[PDB]
Tab-separated table of C-alpha atoms in Angstrom:
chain	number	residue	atom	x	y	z
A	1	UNK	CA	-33.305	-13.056	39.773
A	2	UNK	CA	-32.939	-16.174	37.506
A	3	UNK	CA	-35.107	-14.546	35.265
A	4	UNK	CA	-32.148	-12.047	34.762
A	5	UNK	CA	-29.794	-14.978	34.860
A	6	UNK	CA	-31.136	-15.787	30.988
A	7	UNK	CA	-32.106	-12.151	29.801
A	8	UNK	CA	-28.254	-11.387	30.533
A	9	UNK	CA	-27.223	-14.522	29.112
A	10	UNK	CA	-29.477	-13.762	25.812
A	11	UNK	CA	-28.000	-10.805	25.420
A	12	UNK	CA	-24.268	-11.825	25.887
A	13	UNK	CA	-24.924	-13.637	22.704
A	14	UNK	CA	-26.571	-11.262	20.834
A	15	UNK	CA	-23.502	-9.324	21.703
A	16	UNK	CA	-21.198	-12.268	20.494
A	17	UNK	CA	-22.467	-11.157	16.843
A	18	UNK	CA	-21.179	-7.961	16.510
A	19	UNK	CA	-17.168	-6.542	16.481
A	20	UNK	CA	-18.968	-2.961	17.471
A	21	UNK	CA	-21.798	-3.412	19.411
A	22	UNK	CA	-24.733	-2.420	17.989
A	23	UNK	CA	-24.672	-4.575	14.093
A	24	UNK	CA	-25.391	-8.312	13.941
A	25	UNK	CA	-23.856	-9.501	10.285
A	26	UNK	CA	-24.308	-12.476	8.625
A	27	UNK	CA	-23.629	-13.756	5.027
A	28	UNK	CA	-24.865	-12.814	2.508
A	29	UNK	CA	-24.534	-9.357	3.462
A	30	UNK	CA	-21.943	-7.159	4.397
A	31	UNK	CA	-21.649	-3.857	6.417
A	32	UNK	CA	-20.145	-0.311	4.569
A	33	UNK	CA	-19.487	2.685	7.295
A	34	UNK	CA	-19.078	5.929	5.373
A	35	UNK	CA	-18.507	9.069	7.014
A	36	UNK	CA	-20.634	11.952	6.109
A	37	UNK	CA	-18.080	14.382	4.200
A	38	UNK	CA	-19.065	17.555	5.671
A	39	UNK	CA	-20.118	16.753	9.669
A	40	UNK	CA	-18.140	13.577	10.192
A	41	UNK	CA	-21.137	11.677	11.389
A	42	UNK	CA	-21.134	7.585	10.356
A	43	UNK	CA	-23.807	6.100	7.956
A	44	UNK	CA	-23.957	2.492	7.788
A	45	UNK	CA	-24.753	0.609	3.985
A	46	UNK	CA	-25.389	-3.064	4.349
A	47	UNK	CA	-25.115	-4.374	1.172
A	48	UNK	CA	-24.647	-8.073	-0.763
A	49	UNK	CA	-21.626	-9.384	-0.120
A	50	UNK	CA	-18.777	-9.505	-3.269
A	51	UNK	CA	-15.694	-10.646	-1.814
A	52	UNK	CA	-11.922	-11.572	-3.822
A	53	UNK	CA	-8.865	-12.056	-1.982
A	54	UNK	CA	-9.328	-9.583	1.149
A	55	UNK	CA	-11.139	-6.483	-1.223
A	56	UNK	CA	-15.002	-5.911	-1.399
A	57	UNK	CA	-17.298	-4.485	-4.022
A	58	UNK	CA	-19.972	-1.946	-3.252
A	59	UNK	CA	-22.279	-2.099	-5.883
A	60	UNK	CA	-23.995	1.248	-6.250
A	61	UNK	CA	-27.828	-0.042	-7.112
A	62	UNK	CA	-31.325	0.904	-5.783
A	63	UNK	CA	-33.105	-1.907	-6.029
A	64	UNK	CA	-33.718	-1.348	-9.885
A	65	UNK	CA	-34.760	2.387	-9.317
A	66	UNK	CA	-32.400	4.007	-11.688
A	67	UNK	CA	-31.523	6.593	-9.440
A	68	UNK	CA	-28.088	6.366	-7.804
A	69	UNK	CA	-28.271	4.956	-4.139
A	70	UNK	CA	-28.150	7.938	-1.307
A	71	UNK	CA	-24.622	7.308	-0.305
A	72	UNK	CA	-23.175	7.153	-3.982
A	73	UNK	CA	-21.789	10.560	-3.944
A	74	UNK	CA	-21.118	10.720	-0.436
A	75	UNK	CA	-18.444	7.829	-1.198
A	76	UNK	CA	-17.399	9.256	-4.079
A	77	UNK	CA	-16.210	12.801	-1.934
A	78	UNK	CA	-14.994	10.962	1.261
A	79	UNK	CA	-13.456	7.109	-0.195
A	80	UNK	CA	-12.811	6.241	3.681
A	81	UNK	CA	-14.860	3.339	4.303
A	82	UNK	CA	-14.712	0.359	6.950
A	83	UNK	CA	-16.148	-2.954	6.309
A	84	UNK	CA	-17.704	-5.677	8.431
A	85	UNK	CA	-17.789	-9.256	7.415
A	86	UNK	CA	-19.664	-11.405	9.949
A	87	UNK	CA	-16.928	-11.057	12.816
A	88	UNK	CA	-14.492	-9.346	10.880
A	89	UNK	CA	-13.472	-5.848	10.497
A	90	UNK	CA	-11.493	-3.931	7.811
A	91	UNK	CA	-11.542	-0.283	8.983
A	92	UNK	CA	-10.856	2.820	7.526
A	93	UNK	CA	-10.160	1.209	3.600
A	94	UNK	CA	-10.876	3.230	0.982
A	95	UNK	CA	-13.195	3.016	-1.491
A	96	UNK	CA	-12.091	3.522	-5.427
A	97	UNK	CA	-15.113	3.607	-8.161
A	98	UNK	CA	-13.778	1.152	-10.984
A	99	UNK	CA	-13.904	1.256	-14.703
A	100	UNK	CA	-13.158	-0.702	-18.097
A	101	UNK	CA	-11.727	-4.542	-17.503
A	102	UNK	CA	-11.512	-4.175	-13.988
A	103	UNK	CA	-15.248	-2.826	-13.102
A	104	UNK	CA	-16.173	-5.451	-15.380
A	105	UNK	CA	-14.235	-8.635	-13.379
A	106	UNK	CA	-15.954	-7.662	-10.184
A	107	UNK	CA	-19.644	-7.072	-11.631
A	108	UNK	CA	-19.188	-11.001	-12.720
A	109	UNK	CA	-18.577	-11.517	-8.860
A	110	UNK	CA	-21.329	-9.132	-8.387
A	111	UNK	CA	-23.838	-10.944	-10.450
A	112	UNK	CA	-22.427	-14.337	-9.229
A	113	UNK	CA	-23.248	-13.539	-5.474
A	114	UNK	CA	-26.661	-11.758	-6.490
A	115	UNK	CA	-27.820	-12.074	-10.443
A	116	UNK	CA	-30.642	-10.200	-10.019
A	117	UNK	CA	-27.826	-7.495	-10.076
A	118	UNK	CA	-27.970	-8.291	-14.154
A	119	UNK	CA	-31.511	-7.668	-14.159
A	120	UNK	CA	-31.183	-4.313	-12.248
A	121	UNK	CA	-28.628	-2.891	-15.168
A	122	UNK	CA	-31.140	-4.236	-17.431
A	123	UNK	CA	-33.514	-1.774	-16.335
A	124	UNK	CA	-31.338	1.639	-17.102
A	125	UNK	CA	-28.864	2.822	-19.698
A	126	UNK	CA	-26.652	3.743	-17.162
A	127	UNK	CA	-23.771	1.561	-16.293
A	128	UNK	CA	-24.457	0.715	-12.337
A	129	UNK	CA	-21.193	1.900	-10.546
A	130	UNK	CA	-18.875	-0.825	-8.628
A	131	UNK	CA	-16.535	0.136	-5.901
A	132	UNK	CA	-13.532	-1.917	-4.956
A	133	UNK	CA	-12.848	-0.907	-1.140
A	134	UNK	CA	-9.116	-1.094	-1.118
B	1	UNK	CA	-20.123	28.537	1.089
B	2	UNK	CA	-16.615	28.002	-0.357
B	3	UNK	CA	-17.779	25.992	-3.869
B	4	UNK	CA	-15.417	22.535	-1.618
B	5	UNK	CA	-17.659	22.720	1.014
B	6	UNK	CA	-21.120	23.333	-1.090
B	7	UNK	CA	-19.778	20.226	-2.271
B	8	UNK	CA	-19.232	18.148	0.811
B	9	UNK	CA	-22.578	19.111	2.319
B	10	UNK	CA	-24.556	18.806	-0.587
B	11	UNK	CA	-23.633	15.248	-0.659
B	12	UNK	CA	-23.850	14.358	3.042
B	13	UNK	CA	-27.606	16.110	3.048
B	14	UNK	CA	-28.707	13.444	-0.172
B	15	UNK	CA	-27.045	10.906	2.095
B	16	UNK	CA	-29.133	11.783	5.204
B	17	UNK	CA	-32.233	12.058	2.938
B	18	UNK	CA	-31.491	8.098	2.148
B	19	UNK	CA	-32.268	7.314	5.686
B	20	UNK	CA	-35.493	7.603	8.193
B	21	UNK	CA	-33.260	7.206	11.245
B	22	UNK	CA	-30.187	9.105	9.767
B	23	UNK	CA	-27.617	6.521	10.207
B	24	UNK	CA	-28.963	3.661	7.917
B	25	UNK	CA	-29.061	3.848	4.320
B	26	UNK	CA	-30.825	0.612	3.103
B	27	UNK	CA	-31.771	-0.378	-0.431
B	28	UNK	CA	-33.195	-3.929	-1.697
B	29	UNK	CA	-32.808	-6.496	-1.887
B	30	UNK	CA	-32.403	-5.870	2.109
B	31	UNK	CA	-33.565	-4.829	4.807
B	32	UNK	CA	-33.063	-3.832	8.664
B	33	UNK	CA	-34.156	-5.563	11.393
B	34	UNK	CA	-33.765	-3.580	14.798
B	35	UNK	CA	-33.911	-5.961	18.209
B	36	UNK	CA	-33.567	-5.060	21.570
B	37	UNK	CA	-31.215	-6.494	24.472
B	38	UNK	CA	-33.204	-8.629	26.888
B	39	UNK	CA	-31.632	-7.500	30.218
B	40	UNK	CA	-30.043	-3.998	28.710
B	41	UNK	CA	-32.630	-2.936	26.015
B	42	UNK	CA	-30.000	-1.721	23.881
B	43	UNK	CA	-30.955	-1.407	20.257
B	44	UNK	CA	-28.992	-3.640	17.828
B	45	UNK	CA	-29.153	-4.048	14.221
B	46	UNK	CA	-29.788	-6.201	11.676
B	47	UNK	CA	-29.772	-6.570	7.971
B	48	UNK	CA	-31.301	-9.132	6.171
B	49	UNK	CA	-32.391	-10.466	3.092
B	50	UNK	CA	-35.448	-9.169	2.084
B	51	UNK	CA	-38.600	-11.789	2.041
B	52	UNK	CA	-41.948	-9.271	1.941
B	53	UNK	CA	-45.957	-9.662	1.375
B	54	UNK	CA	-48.524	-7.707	2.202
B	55	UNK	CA	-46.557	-5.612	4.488
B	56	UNK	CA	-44.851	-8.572	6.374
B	57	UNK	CA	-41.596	-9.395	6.812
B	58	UNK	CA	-39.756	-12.774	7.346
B	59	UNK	CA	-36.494	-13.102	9.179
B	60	UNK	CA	-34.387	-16.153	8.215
B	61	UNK	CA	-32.053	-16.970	10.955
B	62	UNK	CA	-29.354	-18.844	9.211
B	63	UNK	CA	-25.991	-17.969	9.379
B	64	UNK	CA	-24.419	-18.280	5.920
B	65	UNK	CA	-24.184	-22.065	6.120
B	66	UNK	CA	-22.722	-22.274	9.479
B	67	UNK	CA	-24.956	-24.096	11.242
B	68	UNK	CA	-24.548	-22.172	14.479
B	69	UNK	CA	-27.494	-19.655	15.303
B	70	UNK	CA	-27.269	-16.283	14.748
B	71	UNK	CA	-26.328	-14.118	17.320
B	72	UNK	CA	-29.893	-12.239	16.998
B	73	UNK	CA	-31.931	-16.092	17.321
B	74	UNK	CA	-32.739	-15.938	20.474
B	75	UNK	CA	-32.840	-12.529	21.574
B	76	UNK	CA	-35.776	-12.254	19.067
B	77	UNK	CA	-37.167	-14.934	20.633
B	78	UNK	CA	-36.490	-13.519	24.300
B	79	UNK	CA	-38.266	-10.123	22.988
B	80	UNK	CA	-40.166	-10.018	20.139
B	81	UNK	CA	-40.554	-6.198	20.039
B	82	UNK	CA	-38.816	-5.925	16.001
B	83	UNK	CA	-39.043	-2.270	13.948
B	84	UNK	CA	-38.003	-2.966	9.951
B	85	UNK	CA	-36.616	-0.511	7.846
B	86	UNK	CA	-37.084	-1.259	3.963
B	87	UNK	CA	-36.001	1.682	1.678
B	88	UNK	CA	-37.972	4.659	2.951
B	89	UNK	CA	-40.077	2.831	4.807
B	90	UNK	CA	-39.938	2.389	8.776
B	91	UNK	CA	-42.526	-0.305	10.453
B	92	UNK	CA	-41.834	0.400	14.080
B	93	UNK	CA	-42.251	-2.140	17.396
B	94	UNK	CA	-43.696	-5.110	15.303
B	95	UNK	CA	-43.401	-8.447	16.287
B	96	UNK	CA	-41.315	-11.224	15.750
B	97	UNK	CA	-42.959	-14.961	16.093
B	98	UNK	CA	-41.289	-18.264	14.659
B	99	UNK	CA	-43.251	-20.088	11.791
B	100	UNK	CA	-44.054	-23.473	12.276
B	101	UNK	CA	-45.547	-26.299	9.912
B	102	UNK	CA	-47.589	-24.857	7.086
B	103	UNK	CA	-46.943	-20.956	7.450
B	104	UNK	CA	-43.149	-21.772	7.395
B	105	UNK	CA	-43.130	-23.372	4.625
B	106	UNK	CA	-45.337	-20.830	3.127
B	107	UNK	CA	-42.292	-18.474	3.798
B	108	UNK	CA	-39.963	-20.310	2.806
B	109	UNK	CA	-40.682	-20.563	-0.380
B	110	UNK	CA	-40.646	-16.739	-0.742
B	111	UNK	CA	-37.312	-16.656	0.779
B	112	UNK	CA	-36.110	-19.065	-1.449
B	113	UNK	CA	-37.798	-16.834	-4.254
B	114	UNK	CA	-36.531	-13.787	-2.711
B	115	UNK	CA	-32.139	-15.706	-2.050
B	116	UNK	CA	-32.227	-19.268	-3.741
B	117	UNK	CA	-28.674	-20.055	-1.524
B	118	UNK	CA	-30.950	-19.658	1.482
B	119	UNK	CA	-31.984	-23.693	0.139
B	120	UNK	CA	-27.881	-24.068	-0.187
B	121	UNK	CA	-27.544	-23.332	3.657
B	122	UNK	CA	-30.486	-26.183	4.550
B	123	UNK	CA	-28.633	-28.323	2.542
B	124	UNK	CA	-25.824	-28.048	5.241
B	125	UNK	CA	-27.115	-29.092	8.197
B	126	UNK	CA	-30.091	-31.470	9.711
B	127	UNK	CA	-31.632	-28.748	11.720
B	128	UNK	CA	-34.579	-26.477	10.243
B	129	UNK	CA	-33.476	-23.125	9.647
B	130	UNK	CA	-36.314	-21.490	11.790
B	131	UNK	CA	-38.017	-18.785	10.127
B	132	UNK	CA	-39.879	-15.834	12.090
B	133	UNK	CA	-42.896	-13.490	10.635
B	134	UNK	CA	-42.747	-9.874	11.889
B	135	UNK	CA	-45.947	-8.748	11.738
């Protein structure tokens, strides 16, 4: 039926927006995989997008909530991590928590591509931890 | 048991705690969006800004200043059938209907409250970036 024609063509493009399958990206956010460090299974972590030179950030807020975000420590014990950037994938990077001068460069990306960012560490003694992915 | 692996579970089970469909770990400011395929009905996913009140949800369909749809545009509009996932919080088989005139522009303004670049991307192109409620 023609009514199929245009459901299948409707989904074709939906399908156009994704390198997997099953996750439509756009700017401003990007897509983190991390890999659950015990069964192997795949979270996903969309997150704002921080971007220099080919290397993200994964900045490691809850929304203000001082408490670390769920997938903090999984990160921390298994650094494999893909990425997905609109129609772009960077699998299998790893992800590296960052301190001193360099943490600092990338939170001014950080608070460049989101400033409320500056308002979340604001809200906690606690200095909010930044990943560079490769 | 061994102290290594009390490690790597422990970890892995806050992880899965993060989540209300075990895969998706989503903290503001975003949210997920989940459509289904027209013909297939194949769940696909999508994260978004998040632009909230009162329990609704708006879904700006630009695409970072490329003035192209989204890929997700029209198969919201196709089916409008749209679950959100905010935090801990799962809204399941909403729907999805474009804003026109007045309520848009009600929107709008949140979303430019919510991601002032969103007013960047209209900047970029002569079309209206259409806005949907999921209610």
């Amino acid at each position: 039926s023609p009514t199929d024609w245009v459901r299948e063509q409707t989904e074709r493009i939906l399908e156009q927006g994704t390198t997997d399958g099953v996750h439509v990206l756009d700017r401003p956010i990007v897509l983190f995989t991390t890999t659950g460090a015990k069964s192997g299974k795949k979270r996903y972590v969309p997150l704002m997008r921080v971007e220099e030179n080919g290397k993200y950030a994964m900045v490691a807020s809850k929304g203000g909530d001082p408490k670390h975000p769920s997938w903090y420590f999984n990160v921390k014990a298994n650094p494999t991590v893909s990425v997905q950037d609109g129609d772009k994938v960077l699998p299998d990077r790893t992800a590296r928590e960052l301190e001193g001068e360099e943490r600092e460069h990338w939170w001014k990306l950080a608070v460049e591509a989101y400033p409320p960012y500056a308002e979340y560490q604001t809200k906690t003694d606690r200095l909010i931890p930044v990943f560079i992915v490769e």
